[PDB]
Amino acid sequence: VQVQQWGAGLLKPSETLSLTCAVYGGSFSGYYWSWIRQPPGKGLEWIGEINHRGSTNYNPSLKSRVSISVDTSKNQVSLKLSSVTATDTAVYYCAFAYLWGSYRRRADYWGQGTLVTVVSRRLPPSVFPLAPSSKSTSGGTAALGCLVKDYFPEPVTVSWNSGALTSGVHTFPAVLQSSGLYSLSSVVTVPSSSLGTQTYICNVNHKPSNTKVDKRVEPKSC
Amino acid sequence: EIVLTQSPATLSLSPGERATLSCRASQSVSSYLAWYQQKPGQAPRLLIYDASNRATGIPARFSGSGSGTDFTLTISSLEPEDFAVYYCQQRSNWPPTYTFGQGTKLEIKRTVAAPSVFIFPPSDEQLKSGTASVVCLLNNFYPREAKVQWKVDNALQSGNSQESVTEQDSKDSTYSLSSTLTLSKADYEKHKVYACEVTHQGLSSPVTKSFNRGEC
């Protein structure tokens, strides 16, 4: 049993959010689908629910903008949210629940969520290398990284060596400055002995501005 | 409006210990109370529904009890995978609506670990751009609490630095912290010595990592 989520997550203000989910691979009798959202770094907010019979309950603070429907032919649920603004930016989850067995035990499954970002503007990051030097070495290892400066909106993803290097990578949570722009850094520990021969590249992807940047981090000598 | 208050806000314990989390409602919600677990970057997961029932596939070490206004979630013997944020959720009104508590964060308590302090002078590319950022890195420490002060030519800074901390590492249960001091190229060229000074519970003296502008 698995839940799959679909739908566009980069929107402009006043547009209409439109998401859909489906669940795979058991029989079901009756069931309930729920939509729940989580703004970045905040708590959970319930959107509404719908059963296999199509009866819906909605959060009245969204009510008048929100609609939830089912297609019971394929275990599909859909969410539409109209007239979106920045306060609707959030990860949107669909959750599927039913009762099974002689004891009518509740089984409950969440999709992994769709990040929805409502912005009218875009500014890509500038990526700068954080060079390993004597100043970032400890006993055979050296820390290096990339500074990802002054982008908007969230989020950026950082990988290393096109995802081949994962162990020990610390990609910090972005900071929102009073200037209105975000910055983060990403760091990783490598052997000093590879610094001459192994090349290290951060892969910074900023989907909201549709920009991907590769920055090679070369070593420094003091 | 019905308000759920969770306590304690934060909690550090080791595997094998028992934890009991509290959720208190502003008014009675009968048995309409659910508990959720959420790990970093993961969807919430239902644990307990209708105050005391275990969801399918949820281990026997999770239990809930309570009614009316006072509810608890108990993990009898904590496993490493049980450290996470736990949310309570209540149902009320007609038509029914749901509300969530603000959450209890339960982290792993390990032995104290001092941070390794590293400093990064601004890149050659960044200095040509017109600003200079100096990054101070505190790697793999515990507990979470740490202090970083910036001193440039023996005078300390304020309002020009930003701090960021990772979540608890899933493998050694440590944290790391970044502090970034940002100046204009003009201000950066006014001074020579840039010092990151660090205090932590795991250190016996404040640790400084330093460089001089232009010498690296």
Tokens of A6: 């679909």
Determine the Cα–Cα distance for residues B22 and A55; give it in Å rounded to an integer.
Answer: 33
> What was the resolution (in A) of this experimentally determined structure?
2.0
Amino acid identity, residue B147? K
Residue B23: its chain A contacts at CB < 8 A?
Answer: none
Which H or E element spans position B187? helix B185-188
Does the distance separating the beta carbons of B126 and A147 come in below 8 Å? yes
Smallest CA–CA distance, residue A24 to chain B, in Å, is 17
Whole-Å CA distances, A178 to A117, A127, A150, A175: 20, 20, 11, 10
CA distance B183 to B129: 12
Residue A215 CA from chain centroid, whole number: 23
Apex CA A194: angle with CA A191 and CA A200, to 5°?
Answer: 90
Chain A within 8 Å of B118 (Cβ-Cβ)? yes
- Interchain CB contact of A221 with B (< 8 Å): yes
Residue of B nearest to A139 (CA): B116
Say which amino acid occupies A94. C
Q: For residue B27, what are its two tokens?
A: 């008014």
Residue A166 near residue A160 (C-beta atoms within 8 A): yes
Report which of A14, A6, A121 is spatially closest to residue A71, judged by C-alpha positions.
A6
| Structural domain span for residue B28 | 4-108
Number of H helices, E strands in chain B: 2, 19
Choosing from B92, B108, B124, the residue where a domain stops is B108
* B54 and B137 together in one domain: no
Cα(A126)–Cα(A128) distance, integer angstroms: 7
> Which residues 175-194 of chain A have a CB within 8 Å of chain B?
175, 177, 183-185, 187, 189
Within chain A, which residue ranges are assigned CATH 2.60.40.10? Answer: 2-118, 126-216
3-state secondary structure of B171: coil
Question: Count of CB atoms within 10 A of residue A80's CB?
Answer: 15
**Cβ neighbours around B156 below 10 Å, total:** 10
Task: Give the span between the Cα atoms of B145 and B127, in whole angstroms.
Answer: 32
Q: Are A32 and A50 in contact (CB under 8 A)?
A: yes
Q: Which helix (H) or strand (E) holds B128?
A: helix B124-129
Name, in order, each residue with C-beta under 8 angstroms of A37's C-beta and a sequence gap of 6 or more: A44, A45, A47, A88, A90, A91, A92, A93, A116
CA gap B198, B182 in Å, rounded: 18
Q: CB A4: neighbour CB atoms within 10 A?
A: 13
CATH of the domain at B123: 2.60.40.10
- As given in the structure block, the two tokens for residue A115 are 């990040």
With CB atoms and an 8 Å threshold, state whether B100 touches A184: no
B chain contacts of residue A97, beta-carbon cutoff 8 Å: 46
**A128 vs B123: CB contact, 8 Å cut-off?**
yes
Q: State which of B84, B108, B132 marks the end of a domain.
A: B108
| Residue of B32, B118, B124, B129 to mutate for A, most A C-beta atoms under 10 A | B118
Domain count, chain B: 2
Q: Look up the CATH number of domain A2-118.
A: 2.60.40.10
Beta bridge partner(s), residue A91: A38, A115
- Token pair 């390794």 is at which residue? B116
Q: Are B67 and B27 in contact (CB under 8 A)?
A: no
CA closest to A145 among chain B residues: B120
Dihedral over Cα of A172, A176, A178, A183: its sign = positive
Structure-block tokens of residue B30: 């009968």
**What is the CATH class of A126-216?**
mainly beta
Phi, psi of A197 (to 5 degrees): -115, -35
Residues in chain B: 216
Tokens 């983060």, residue? Answer: A184
Domain boundary among B75, B108, B141: B108
Domain match, B73 and B136 both: no
Alpha-carbon distance of B192 to B211, in angstroms, equals: 8
Residue B1 forms contact with A (CB below 8 Å): no
Do residue A145 and residue B135 have CB atoms under 8 angstroms apart? yes
- Separation between Cα atoms, residue A127 and residue A207, nearest integer Å: 15
Cβ–Cβ below 8 Å for A44 and B36: yes
DSSP characters over A141-210: EEEEEEEEEEEBSS--EEEEGGGTB-TT-EEPPPEE-TTS-EEEEEEEEEEGGGTTTS--EEEEEEGGGT
DSSP 3-state assignment of A33?
strand
Question: Which residue numbers in chain A precede an interruption (C–N > 2.5 Å)?
Answer: none
Calpha distance A170→B91 (Å, rounded): 39
Residue of A nearest to B176 (CA): A170
Instruction: Tell the residue number behind the tokens 């740490």, with chain if given.
Output: B146
